Amino acid sequence: CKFLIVSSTAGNKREGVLKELAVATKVKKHLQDDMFIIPLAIDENLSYDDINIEIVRLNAIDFKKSWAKGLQDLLDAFEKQNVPKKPPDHSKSNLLYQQIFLHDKQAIEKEE
Amino acid sequence: CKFLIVSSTAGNKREGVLKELAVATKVKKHLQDDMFIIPLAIDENLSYDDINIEIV
Amino acid sequence: MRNKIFISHATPEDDDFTRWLSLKLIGLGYEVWCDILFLDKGVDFWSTIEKEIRENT
Amino acid sequence: MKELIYIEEPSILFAHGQKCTDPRDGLALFGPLNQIYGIKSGVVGTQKGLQIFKSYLDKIQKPIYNHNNITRPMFPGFEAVFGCKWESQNIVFKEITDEEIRRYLFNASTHKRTYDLVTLFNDKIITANKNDEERVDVWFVIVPEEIYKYCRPNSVLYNYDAQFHDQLKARLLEHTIPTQILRESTLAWRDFKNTFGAPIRDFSKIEGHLAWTISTAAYYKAGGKPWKLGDIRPGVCYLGLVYKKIEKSKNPQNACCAAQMFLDNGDGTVFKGEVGPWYNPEKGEYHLKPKEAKALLTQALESYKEQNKSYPKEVFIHARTRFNDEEWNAFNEVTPKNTNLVGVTITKSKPLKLYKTEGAFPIMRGNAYIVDEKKAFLWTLGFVPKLQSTLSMEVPNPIFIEINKGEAEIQQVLKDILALTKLNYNACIYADGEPVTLRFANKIGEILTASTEIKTPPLAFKYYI
């Protein structure tokens, strides 16, 4: 429903992110919605004029000097763009966090 | 060295020419050259008011 | 149908007065458009600027 | 043939009732249990310290990285990790003239220099918060490096203590002001080098830990609770009892005991144990005479009644010395018949270095070695897989525990002190060897022993760490 592209220093020259941006541009042209792509800028060292072109037209979101207000404006832009949602629950987040990020960092049951 | 943009009727709505114009403005404020962009007026039905912002 | 109120300013060198004026006119009962409030980040600007200027301002 | 039983890694609660095991990652993912509306920083020091603190605070505002997030996680910004706002504006600053520093420098004995400088900072803070209308939740004392270096207790060109922050918090204890002293070289290491031309206070890779510790200390001293313990039974009270002795010359040290208390949350309610001129320093066996023992027990029971309204069903006592019979007999009859009293001794001097056959890895943290029903071992130090590194250094050394009196499950107190080891607040490390009731014990004893002139210390924790 919404596309989020990170316009990082290394996120504007890799082939994969540019190809994903190209197919995102194609599907946003098919869907005829300009709010499909929401760019994300996180590095101050990358100037505004050095980004790839699909980030030039859209105003890239603010995530550089702080993250809390950036997440807040992303959230309120989302709910003002009327994205369907579920009630908040961190239990799914907790389950995912225990699922992926604790796959090689846990004690095992072996004899030592 | 110089940017030439056709400011026709099809040169306004089309996304690619607008994108090239935007990065032309970026490189013209990079190079401190106000003469970097040379607009080209082809269509007669298009006046000087209905062009896009970066051409006015 | 053109009733929008357009405010142009040097972002962000005059953000405070623009914000206060936009809030005051939108609480007074005027549909006021400004770059800070309605043009939130993540939105294309210049096409929307043109459409508001030539359509609703 | 004995084995080593396993105790599961204890869990700490977080925002929205979420359960994790790491405080840094849990804070970065969920945040504090209770929110505060905002803090206002106050600073005392030179204008150089002021700009250094401002630079470090705006650096903290930015998301800063480290080498890798496996051991030392990145800082996502104070606002994104705590939900509170930190700004470089509305900050109250008080300047100290360096000419006064020069005037105080040429004194003969450094002790009176320490006294006058400490009192100058103290009454500067008192004047600052007694006139300024702007509330200051936490005062940041930016001490200069050369003051910490050239005015050391043995630096070469009685109840008052030669340590700077000891006397600072001791004489600031009587006005309920949460302060935190910041060494200048800690947050000005960029321009600080040694004689060779290198930063001896180097954080070229590790400054994320500094940001984490400073941020969590600032949030804790503000009033908000960063994290608490997961499971606490209805009627269990922990009593981490201090048994640290000072060497207070011919003044009778006797027993400078204090006590920490955890009852339902991470809230510590420290009530001042008596100085107790009985048993002069020739008799330093920490044998509490019955009147002070019952007074301390009454203090603990009254605090539990004030915070819980219900009588506790079991009292957990943590200390580090052996317990004699008469002290426990005094501890018994005051307690009601329904409750239970048990005492645990924690020590480090017992040597037990468990080595590894293959590879170069230490003992995984959480192993428990049981010798008898009374005596047991707990490996609170060593490798932990959530960190993918060892918290200990070289070879970890365990803490020898031993229940003296009362009937209780040994694995119960093992897992309970394991949970108690996770509640460190001054430093945002994963865990420490000694439990936090014993970790705070020595420092709060040093705080209380630096000012005899007080009589009712506040029982909070912001004015101590």
DSSP state of D75: B
Q: Report CB contact under 8 Å: C49, B52.
A: no
Question: What is the C-alpha to C-alpha distance for residues A9 and D96, in angstroms, rounded to an integer?
Answer: 43
For residue B26, list chain C residues with Cβ-Cβ distance below 8 A: none
Going from the C-alpha of A110 to that of each of A93, A107, B53, D7, the distances in angstroms are 30, 9, 69, 15
Q: Report CB contact under 8 Å: B52, C46.
A: yes
Residue owning tokens 């209905």: B50
Token duo for residue B11 = 């040169």
B56 in contact with A at a CB cutoff of 8 Å?
no
Question: What is the C-alpha to C-alpha distance for residues A11 and A97, in angstroms, rounded to an integer?
Answer: 25
For residue C49, list chain B residues with Cβ-Cβ distance below 8 A: 53
Question: What is the C-alpha to C-alpha distance for residues D262 and D270, in angstroms, rounded to an integer?
Answer: 9
Chains sharing 3 or more CB pairs under 8 A with chain A: B, C, D
Q: Report CB contact under 8 Å: A65, D62.
A: yes
If you measure CA to CA, which chain C residue comes closest to B51?
C50
Bridge partner list, A39? A5
**Residue D122 labeled ligand binder:** no
If you measure CA to CA, which chain D residue comes closest to A65?
D62
Q: What φ, ψ does residue D367 adopt, rounded to 5°?
A: -70, 140
DSSP state of D176: T
Closest to D119 in 3D by CA, of D172, D57, D76, D72: D172
Count of CB contacts below 8 A, A vs B? 16
Token duo for residue B23 = 């990065």
Q: Residue C8: how many CB atoms within 10 A of its CB? A: 11
If you measure CA to CA, which chain C residue comes closest to B22?
C46
Chains sharing 3 or more CB pairs under 8 A with chain D: A
Q: Judge whether C6 and C52 are in contact, CB under 8 Å.
A: yes
Minimal Cβ distance to A56: which of B19, B29, B30: B19
Q: Residue A37: how many CB atoms within 10 A of its CB? A: 22
Judged on CB neighbours under 10 Å (0-12, 13-18, 19+), D280 is exposed
Sign of CA dihedral B36, B37, B42, B44: negative
C51 in contact with A at a CB cutoff of 8 Å?
no
User: Looking at CA atoms only, how far is residue D274 from chain A in angstroms?
Assistant: 45
| D/A touch flag: 3 or more CB pairs below 8 Å | yes
For helices D110-131 and D98-105, angle between their N-to-C axes, nearest 10 degrees: 150
Q: Report CB contact under 8 Å: A97, D29.
A: yes
Selected for mutation to probe chain C from A42, A54, A59, A80 (highest C CB count within 10 Å) is A59
Judged on CB neighbours under 10 Å (0-12, 13-18, 19+), A14 is exposed
Bridge partner list, D289? none
Selected for mutation to probe chain B from A12, A49, A51 (highest B CB count within 10 Å) is A49
Question: What is the C-alpha to C-alpha distance for residues D134 and A27, in angstroms, rounded to an integer?
Answer: 54
For helices D436-449 and D164-172, angle between their N-to-C axes, nearest 10 degrees: 80
Q: Residue C52: how many CB atoms within 10 A of its CB? A: 16
Question: What is the C-alpha to C-alpha distance for residues D221 and D170, in angstroms, rounded to an integer?
Answer: 16
Question: What is the C-alpha to C-alpha distance for residues B20 and A101, in angstroms, rounded to an integer?
Answer: 43
Closest to D353 in 3D by CA, of D361, D364, D363, D345: D363
User: Looking at CA atoms only, how far is residue A87 from chain C in angstroms?
Assistant: 24
DSSP for D394-462 reads SS---EEEEE-SS---HHHHHHHHHHHTT---SS--S--SS-HHHHHHHHHHHHHHT-TT-SS--S-ST
**Residue D246 labeled ligand binder:** no
Residue window 18-37, chain B: list those with CB within 8 Å of chain A: 18-19, 22-23, 26-27, 29-30
**Residue D465 labeled ligand binder:** yes
User: Looking at CA atoms only, how far is residue A90 from chain D in angstroms?
Assistant: 7
User: Looking at CA atoms only, how far is residue B24 from chain A in angstroms?
Assistant: 10
Q: Report CB contact under 8 Å: A66, D79.
A: yes
Half-sphere exposure of B9 (CA within 13 A, CB side): 5
Resolution in A: 3.4
User: Looking at CA atoms only, how far is residue D353 from chain A in angstroms?
Assistant: 16
DSSP state of D3: -
Q: Judge whether A68 and A87 are in contact, CB under 8 Å.
A: no
Q: Report CB contact under 8 Å: C42, A57.
A: no
Ranges assigned E (strand) in D83-224 = 92-95, 138-143, 179-183
Q: What φ, ψ does residue D137 adopt, rounded to 5°?
A: -75, -45
Q: Report CB contact under 8 Å: A67, D76.
A: yes
Question: What is the C-alpha to C-alpha distance for residues D158 and D450, in angstroms, rounded to an integer?
Answer: 9
User: Looking at CA atoms only, how far is residue C1 from chain A in angstroms?
Assistant: 23
Residue window 23-42, chain A: list those with CB within 8 Å of chain C: 34-35, 38-39
If you measure CA to CA, which chain A residue comes closest to B20?
A53
Token duo for residue A26 = 């194609």
Question: What is the C-alpha to C-alpha distance for residues D24 and D219, in angstroms, rounded to an integer?
Answer: 13
For helices D164-172 and D110-131, angle between their N-to-C axes, nearest 10 degrees: 40
